[PDB]
Design a protein around this ligand. Sequence first.
Ligand SMILES: O=C1NS(=O)(=O)c2ccccc21
Ligand SMILES: [Zn+2]
Length: 258
Amino acid sequence: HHWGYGKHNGPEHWHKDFPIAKGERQSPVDIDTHTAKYDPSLKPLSVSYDQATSLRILNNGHSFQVTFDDSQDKAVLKGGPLDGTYRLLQFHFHWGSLDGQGSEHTVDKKKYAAELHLVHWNTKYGDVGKAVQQPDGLAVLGIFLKVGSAKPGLQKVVDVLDSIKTEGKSADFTNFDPRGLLPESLDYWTYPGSLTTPPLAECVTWIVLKEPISVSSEQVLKFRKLNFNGEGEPEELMVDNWRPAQPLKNRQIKASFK
Ligand SMILES: O=C1NS(=O)(=O)c2ccccc21
Ligand SMILES: [Zn+2]
């Protein structure tokens, strides 16, 4: 039927409705650290999030997302491998049922407990619908989560998840500052890829940060209490909403750091 992460509608099935699933620049990938190429021409990232305006938090049946006002250049990503200005639209997570899985990208086949995606779109295309039709339309900042100490900047998100437990629920979520989710270092890997969910469009420049953030076991446990199902349907816990690594094919992963 409609796509998801179960036995009968999971990532192995998606190609029947979205044939680009078997395409040439699909994501995620496994980032072999010994094969990645250091590119000294790569610039530092510029992350300008001080004027970010968060709007809502929503359970969309596949993850939960926080949306931002992208009507002007308030929260933007520039630099790195990018040409031009990319506006922050939303962030969301992918996570596991157990601490040793949940990330989409892997590093030397190591999985992390979760992965944060900050989705941005290229303002030269005017709106995000147009941007997803272009090979340089989106830039996604990917951040790994490991279980350790708590991340205080994540706690405002954890505490509202009760209010959006089931598919289709949303809540007001204003004045959230996404700078509290960033690691110390902005060293990164980058490669050309795709959305990791349908429609799997090949429109993404991936920027995957080397340094994970730490979250506590209690914080991640709250992800795992969300539901895939709508209210009044049989309860299915929202866990393991990650797509496995795809073949690299004719791509090179570049590193900003030696
Ligand atoms: O689920 C997703 N992972 S992603 O960052 O590739 C992305 C981009 C746009 C819409 C959804 C999604
Ligand atoms: Zn994602």
